[PDB]
Amino acid sequence: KIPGYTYGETENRAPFNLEDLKLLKEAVMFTAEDEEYIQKAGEVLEDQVEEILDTWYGFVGSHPHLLYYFTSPDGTPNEKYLAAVRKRFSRWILDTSNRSYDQAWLDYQYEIGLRHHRTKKNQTDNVESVPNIGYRYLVAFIYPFTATMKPFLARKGHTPEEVEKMYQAWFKATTLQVALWSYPYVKYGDF
Amino acid sequence: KIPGYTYGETENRAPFNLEDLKLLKEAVMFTAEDEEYIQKAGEVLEDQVEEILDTWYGFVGSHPHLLYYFTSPDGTPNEKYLAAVRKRFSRWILDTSNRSYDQAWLDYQYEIGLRHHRTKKNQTDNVESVPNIGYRYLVAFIYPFTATMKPFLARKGHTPEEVEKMYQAWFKATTLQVALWSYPYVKYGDF
Numbered sequence: 001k002i003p004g005y006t007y008g009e010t011e012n013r014a015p016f017n018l019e020d021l022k023l024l025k026e027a028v029m030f031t032a033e034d035e036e037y038i039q040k041a042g043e044v045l046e047d048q049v050e051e052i053l054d055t056w057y058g059f060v061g062s063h064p065h066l067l068y069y070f071t072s073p074d075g076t077p078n079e080k081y082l083a084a085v086r087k088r089f090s091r092w093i094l095d096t097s098n099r100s101y102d103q104a105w106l107d108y109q110y111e112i113g114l115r116h117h118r119t120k121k122n123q124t125d126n127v128e129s130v131p132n133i134g135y136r137y138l139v140a141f142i143y144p145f146t147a148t149m150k151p152f153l154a155r156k157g158h159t160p161e162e163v164e165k166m167y168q169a170w171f172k173a174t175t176l177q178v179a180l181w182s183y184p185y186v187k188y189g190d191f
Numbered sequence: 192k193i194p195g196y197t198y199g200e201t202e203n204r205a206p207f208n209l210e211d212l213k214l215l216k217e218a219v220m221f222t223a224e225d226e227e228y229i230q231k232a233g234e235v236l237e238d239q240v241e242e243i244l245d246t247w248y249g250f251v252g253s254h255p256h257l258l259y260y261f262t263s264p265d266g267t268p269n270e271k272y273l274a275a276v277r278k279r280f281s282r283w284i285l286d287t288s289n290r291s292y293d294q295a296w297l298d299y300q301y302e303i304g305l306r307h308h309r310t311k312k313n314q315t316d317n318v319e320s321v322p323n324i325g326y327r328y329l330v331a332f333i334y335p336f337t338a339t340m341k342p343f344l345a346r347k348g349h350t351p352e353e354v355e356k357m358y359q360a361w362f363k364a365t366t367l368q369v370a371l372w373s374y375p376y377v378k379y380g381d382f
């Protein structure tokens with residue numbers, strides 16, 4: 001039903017496993033408290049996803065060198081591409097909140113990294129676009145993504161601590177995932 | 192006077208320039224407001240740097256797979272290595288606050304990336320240690336670094352907005368720099 005969304009039906013096993021994930025979670029100070037707070041945040045954000053997506057792609061569309069990654073060769077945004085990616089991003093927000101971070105989760109994170117990278121970019125949607133998303137922007141996007149998310153987390157009326165715990169859990173989870181997605185970009189053996 | 196600190200005397204021009212930097216600053220939503228707030232934060236943090244360093248290396252030392260990157264071949268921390276890096280980290284905190292982010296700043300960021308990477312790791316201090324810091328941990332460290340910094344920013348008694356503006360400026364600046372440092376790790380042409 002969501003075109004191109006292949007969580008749990010990926011073709012490849014990730015080159016990282018649950019032991020790697022344990023060690024990476026430690027590097028981002030993610031614990032069981034964060035698991036609980038990310039799940040709570042899912043409940044807060046669930047009815048807000050359309051507006052989150054409009055704000056997020058508003059930012060991407062606000063800078064030509066960012067919108068660039070969704071463009072057709074003629075430099076104009078590929079509207080099919082954008083709309084199809086948007087649907088999978090909506091799922092990713094929910095998955096971050098509700099999935100057990102197990103090997104199927106890791107296999108999908110590897111797949112998402114491959115889809116930003118030249119390895120698989122443009123294949124899922126069968127579009128003609130830019131071959132690769134420069135890595136420098138994947139890392140950079142940790143910031144604006146967390147900044148876009150923060151105001152939404154307030155709105156179900158929660159204590160300041162709860163809201164900071166949810167935002168911080170999202171900052172950890174975002175950093176964790178972007179780190180995983182780096183794999184196909186990194187010189188073999190340097191990751 | 193600070194061994195190995197070669198800001199402004201680097202051997203190589205960075206493969207990125209001030210136009211790249213403009214585009215990356217936009218990707219992390221860094222503006223002139225952030226320049227002002229990062230400078231303000233420098234004034235707040237200046238007398239606190241020793242304690243920041245003790246807290247930061249407390250975290251690194253708290254996980255064997257992280258402390259690993261400062262170890263001698265026998266698996267024990269190289270104390271010379273740690274102490275020498277600590278001095279340059281102290282400078283980096285101040286430089287983030289006070290340097291114009293120009294080509295000399297970029298050339299040093301390239302150098303810092305090279306020093307985490309196998310390209311130059313262990314050369315500055317002439318130590319025998321792990322050849323490479325896996326990239327996955329450079330990205331991950333954005334989180335704990337910002338989390339370690341946050342409580343220090345409170346303590347000169349500033350408004351909540353001011354403190355959040357300073358923390359957010361530091362989160363942007365950290366993300367920006369780690370993105371730059373990724374260069375030698377990334378497959379040529381994918382950055």
Ligand code: HEM
Pocket residue numbers: 004005006060066067069070085088089092112115116120121122123124125133137138139141142143145174178
């Ligand atoms: C914090 C960083 C980022 C997050 C959280 C994120 C999130 C996502 C998600 C969830 C998807 C869909 C994955 C799937 O197919 O199921 C996706 C795809 C995509 N993203 Fe990102 N992304 C990030 C960085 C970037 C950057 C820097 C760009 C550059 C504008 C970008 C542009 C795209 C594009 C063009 C696709 C489609 C890739 C393809 O052809 O399959 N993303 N992103």
Ligand code: HEM
Pocket residue numbers: 195196197251257258260261276279280283303306307311312313314315316324328329330332333334336365369
């Ligand atoms: C947010 C991420 C990070 C920040 C802000 C940071 C900061 C720094 C700074 C400022 C230096 C000294 C640069 C110079 O020589 O002037 C340095 C060196 C070093 N860092 Fe990091 N670092 C980060 C990620 C990491 C990670 C993930 C590790 C793994 C423990 C690590 C371990 C080291 C080591 C071993 C050196 C010495 C490298 C060499 O041999 O020259 N750093 N770091």
Ligand SMILES: [C-]#N
Pocket residue numbers: 089
């Ligand atoms: C990516 N959105």
Ligand SMILES: [C-]#N
Pocket residue numbers: 280
């Ligand atoms: C790196 N400390």
